[PDB]
């Protein structure tokens, strides 16, 4: 069980760690988060009390280094940093644990939610979507745009998700216009799965990462990417059976976790009605359709 130390908490802030959220008061004696489960990526995110503008946060994996948070009064945010001196770090954490200054990752033992939301998410792939190679962790915020968004403006600060565009030469084989537009199997299976992602695990990992950035930061381009990747599968007549069964599980836990009061902005009525009721896979997502109908029957 690993730990992320905070030097201090000089400004009042809501801190979230995965699907959990807690409030820290200005100059409260808070020195971080302990008992973080090893084996998963994690995200530690922030919303300042005085300016709800800009949710921001850091994706990280404690197996890849010792990380801590320190407020920067010049740039005005909580920054993640790596501590290379391992004995200094252990000693700082031990002292803060002894003084009971750290909150505890509150994982209920029955609870597989975070595993189920990050099953295919790997740090190495996050770091290729979010390019800042001098750090082992990845910053994301509410305002960051995606590569595809910038095509339609600072590239260093972009989310380099895989571009998906249903009316593009990549998506449409010359001479198979109608076939490929009405049945996206070619684009899913040959172009994206065989060509770009290599396997369905990497595809699902980007899908899950995009959802989590949408949910935790309100990142609009991430929400677009999540829906596009769902729609590409649902609009394909030919999808491996294991991929469909896994997709249903993935979406089920995403819909289960979504705050009820954010459904209006984070769910696209067109995509979901098409996917659940008109698409080739309208009958392949039983778990997702049942939770959608009991939780968001208005959207449908």
């Amino acid at each position: 069980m690993n730990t992320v130390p905070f030097t201090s908490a000089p400004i009042e802030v809501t801190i979230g760690i995965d699907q959990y959220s807690f409030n820290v008061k200005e100059n409260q004696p808070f020195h971080g988060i302990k008992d973080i489960p090893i084996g998963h990526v994690h995200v530690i995110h922030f919303q300042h009390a005085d300016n709800s503008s800009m949710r921001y946060g850091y994706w990280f994996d404690c197996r890849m280094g010792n990380f801590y948070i320190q407020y920067d009064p010049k740039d005005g945010l909580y920054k993640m940093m790596e501590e290379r001196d391992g004995a200094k770090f252990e000693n700082i954490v031990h002292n803060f644990k002894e003084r009971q200054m750290m909150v505890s990752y509150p994982k209920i033992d029955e609870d597989d939610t975070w595993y189920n939301l990050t099953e295919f998410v790997q740090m190495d792939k996050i770091r290729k979507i979010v390019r800042k190679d001098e750090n082992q962790f990845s910053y994301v915020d509410s305002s960051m745009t995606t590569v595809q968004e910038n095509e339609l403006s600072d590239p260093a600060h972009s989310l380099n998700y895989t571009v998906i565009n249903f009316k593009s030469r990549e998506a449409i084989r010359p001479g198979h216009e109608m076939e490929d537009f009405l049945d996206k199997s070619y684009y899913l299976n040959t172009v994206m799965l065989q060509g770009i992602f290599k396997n369905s695990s990497n595809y699902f990992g980007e899908l899950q990462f995009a959802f989590l950035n949408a949910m935790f930061f309100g990142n609009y381009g991430s929400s677009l990417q999540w829906h596009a990747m769902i729609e590409l599968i649902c609009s394909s007549a030919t999808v491996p059976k294991h991929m469909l069964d896994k997709l249903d599980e993935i979406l089920y836990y995403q819909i289960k976790t979504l705050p009820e009061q954010y459904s209006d902005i984070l769910l696209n009525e067109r995509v979901w009605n098409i996917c659940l009721y008109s698409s080739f896979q309208k009958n392949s997502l039983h778990n997702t359709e049942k939770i959608m109908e009991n939780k968001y029957p208005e959207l449908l």
Partner: protein, 237 residues
């Protein structure tokens, strides 16, 4: 974006453009089967592709053989239309290719956009005008060449005859749309108007009668009467 009353003079500027109407591509007669079920029989159709500035009608005749063994024909018809329009553009010299293609029905937008991905600079646009191009099969010489076709064939008509020698393309288009609206609202009456007088003939190389300027004003007034009449007869006014 969408083509409407606000930007109507754009049709007659010097940027090459084409209207595409697909309303006569897939045509059927519905009939009873010996067992008392209903079935369709397709008949030959056509794509109506028109330069409104010059009057050039590129009429691709759609032979019934193109539907043999195919499913979802109303959907296929839109993609067939888009394939044939894309093939026409590719067959034209660069300097003759349109800068815009305006579709008369919005369901042609995605099929045409996908077929024209190779032409990113050609804009595919809808229109809010309710154009009467479906009535093109009420023009006798166009209907004749469609129904006689034994194979796919492109007929090359100027739908204004020689009118542009005497009038502008705005006026020629207005005359065409009035004639076609009339033929659409009451074909029998419209054709009676156009042919009542046996001394006014249709040249072998024309579609419409050789009316003097004065006779066209008479004709045009008779077509507006017909349209208003039918609008009364229809709504009781």
């Amino acid at each position: 974006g969408a083509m409407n009353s606000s930007n109507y003079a754009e049709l007659f500027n010097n940027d090459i453009k084409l209207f595409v109407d697909d309303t006569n591509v897939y045509r059927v007669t519905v009939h009873k089967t010996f067992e008392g079920n209903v079935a369709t029989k397709a008949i030959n159709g056509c794509i109506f592709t028109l330069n409104p500035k010059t009057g050039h009608l590129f009429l691709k005749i759609i032979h019934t053989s193109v539907w043999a063994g195919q499913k979802r024909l109303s959907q296929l018809a839109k993609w067939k239309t888009a394939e044939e329009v894309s093939a026409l553009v590719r067959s034209l010299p660069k300097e003759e290719q349109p800068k815009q293609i305006i579709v008369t029905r919005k369901a042609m937008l995605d099929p045409l956009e996908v077929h024209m991905l190779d032409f990113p600079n050609i804009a595919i646009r809808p229109t809010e005008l309710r154009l009467p191009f479906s009535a093109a099969m009420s023009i006798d010489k166009l209907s004749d060449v469609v129904m006689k076709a034994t194979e796919p064939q492109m007929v090359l008509f100027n739908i204004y005859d020689d009118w542009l020698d005497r009038i502008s393309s705005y006026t020629a288009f207005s005359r065409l749309t009035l004639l076609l609206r009339a033929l659409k609202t009451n074909e029998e009456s419209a054709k009676m108007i156009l042919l009542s007088d046996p001394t006014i003939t249709i040249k072998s190389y024309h579609l419409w009668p050789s009316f003097t300027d004065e006779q066209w004003i008479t004709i045009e007034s008779q077509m507006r009467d017909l349209i208003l009449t039918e609008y009364g007869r229809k709504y009781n006014v």
